[PDB]
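Request from the bench team (R.T.):
"We need a structural guess for the complex before ordering more zinc ion. Sequence and SMILES attached. Just send the tokens back."

Command: build protein-zinc ion structure.
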Amino acid sequence: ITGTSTVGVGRGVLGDQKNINTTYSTYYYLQDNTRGNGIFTYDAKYRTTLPGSLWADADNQFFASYDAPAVDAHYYAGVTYDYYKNVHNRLSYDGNNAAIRSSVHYSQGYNNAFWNGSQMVYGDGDGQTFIPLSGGIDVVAHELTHAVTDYTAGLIYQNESGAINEAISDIFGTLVEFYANKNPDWEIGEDVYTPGISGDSLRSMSDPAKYGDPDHYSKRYTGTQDNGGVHINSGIINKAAYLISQGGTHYGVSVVGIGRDKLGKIFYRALTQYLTPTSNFSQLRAAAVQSATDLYGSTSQEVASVKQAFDAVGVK
Ligand SMILES: CC(C)C[C@H](NP(=O)(O)CNC(=O)OCc1ccccc1)C(=O)NC[C@H](C)C(C)(C)C
Ligand SMILES: [Ca+2]
Ligand SMILES: [Ca+2]
Ligand SMILES: [Ca+2]
Ligand SMILES: [Ca+2]
Ligand SMILES: [Zn+2]
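Reply to R.T.: structure attached below.
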């Protein structure tokens, strides 16, 4: 909407206060004009029609319980925008400052979040498996990263290409979580998963097997559930990424860590210059090797560590 840029204050899903960029025109809207061609947050009102209505508020204060998922979807979309722009020189998901749109309060008891081809969508959860999913910065960045992938490599959402697609979203979700630097970890979704159980998460990148997911290619899922295991076999690539960054010895194969920033550079280059819609795990290895070679040189530690990490997870 046309109006003037304003700054509201509110509380997120986990009770923390934050400032948000809004727009004033009669009402205060969740419309952040400070980033690209805007970040827009919508109320889906417990229904499944999308996007719903652009979030309107009478006083620019967002402390009601109903407001909390909107505050966090809006704020964490801004952090994710900043990560891509400041770290990778990428302007929004399309590289051309496309408007970023999210809807919260999607459906009833909805234990998921997704990119629908055009926008982000967040359930409120059922209060048992999830609380409102925009409360996790890694979740928000995971969702926006699907849009980045779709505009770049275009990885088809099934089988190995789909597991790479998933891992890319978990990798960058985690790197955004570290960028914001509030309780960062290599776990996925811990802030919004299972409020009655402490210390768990939806997935682990450091130890995927803790939540049933494979940590070696020989343990990959080969059935048809979950689009051929896209949220399962992502563990193999997540583990490789974790090892590239942090190092370790895994199934007897030692990996020298090179740190998060270089991990992000390697994978961003692979995603945007080398991967294609049908890339498989072996082709991802090749793309990561080539990316590290471009950035750091063929004889570099970074190239050697990429090879070590894919060896450790059984991907040649
Ligand atoms: C980070 C996590 C909290 C949320 C993430 N959602 P996502 O991976 O973004 C789902 N996306 C999806 O299914 O996209 C396909 C598509 C394409 C077009 C329109 C609509 C949909 C996820 O890991 N979901 C897995 C869920 C919870 C289980 C039940 C399978 C374990
Ligand atoms: Ca208000
Ligand atoms: Ca965390
Ligand atoms: Ca996390
Ligand atoms: Ca929990
Ligand atoms: Zn995903």
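Two things stood out. The first strand starts at residue 4 and ends at 11. Helices lie at 68-88, 137-151, 159-180, 225-229, 234-246, 260-274, 281-296, 301-312.
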